[PDB]
Ligand binder design. Structure first.
Ligand SMILES: C[C@H](CS)C(=O)N1CCC[C@H]1C(=O)O
Ligand SMILES: [Zn+2]
Ligand SMILES: [Zn+2]
Length: 228
């Protein structure tokens, strides 16, 4: 782990790093959230902001120091603060931003700034490619409603990594966390659909646990079975 200001960065693969940021949530403690940073040749791609604009600017500072290539785009994985709280920092930096159309719709009411571009998805869950131009190795999949109605997931081609965002918890998690915005009927199926979309991914990265094996997916889905 590299501590960089109040954030933590961890290399996961030759071209992939996890960013971690923290927010004091009165009544919960200081909650970690993870996203990703991917180098694709001469550019960098970001998955999720940090909780705040200031923290997100720090991600960009770390990128400048440790990679020193332009950030071509960011994709954010639903309209909650841990994933979209730093949108303004990305925009101030001139970075093109992408989210599920539904996330952009929900952003204002959730207290978020919308991304500049909207992703749309085929019936089978795969992103419509024209809406995700120049995404390089990022393979974006809508697994169905679960943690939220708008949650999306991202595989990284050329690696063993798939990112479940807040949909997936690790194999030892005691619960699925706050289900206030969740689709309890469909959660289990959505978790399993994520697994089926990225069947060869052996490292599952997620927002609120450290990277784990595919047991994160099976355990998450099994816990979600109980919501029905
Ligand atoms: C505010 C975030 C948005 S995904 C959240 O709901 N969290 C963060 C950690 C788990 C869960 C919770 O509070 O129950
Ligand atoms: Zn969330
Ligand atoms: Zn979250």
């Amino acid at each position: 782990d590299q501590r960089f200001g109040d954030l933590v960065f961890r290399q996961l693969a030759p071209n992939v790093w996890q960013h971690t940021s923290y927010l004091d949530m009165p009544g919960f403690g200081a909650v970690a959230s993870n996203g990703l940073i991917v180098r694709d040749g001469g550019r960098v791609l970001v998955v999720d902001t940090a909780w705040t604009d200031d923290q997100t600017a720090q991600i960009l500072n770390w990128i400048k120091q440790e990679i020193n290539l332009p950030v071509a785009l960011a994709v954010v994985t639903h309209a909650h603060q841990d994933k979209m709280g730093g949108m303004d920092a990305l925009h101030a930096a001139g970075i093109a931003t992408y989210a599920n159309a539904l996330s952009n719709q929900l952003a204002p009411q959730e207290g978020m700034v919308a991304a500049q571009h909207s992703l749309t998805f085929a019936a089978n869950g795969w992103v419509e490619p024209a809406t995700a131009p120049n995404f390089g190795p990022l393979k974006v999949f809508y697994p169905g409603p679960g943690h939220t109605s708008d949650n999306i997931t991202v595989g990284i081609d050329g690696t063993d990594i798939a990112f479940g965002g807040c949909l997936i918890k690790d194999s030892k998690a005691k619960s699925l966390g706050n289900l206030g915005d969740a689709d309890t009927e469909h959660y289990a199926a959505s978790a399993r659909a994520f697994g089926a979309a990225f069947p060869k991914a052996s490292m599952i990265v997620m927002s609120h646990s450290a990277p784990d094996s595919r047991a994160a997916i099976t355990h998450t889905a099994r816990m979600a079975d109980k919501l029905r």
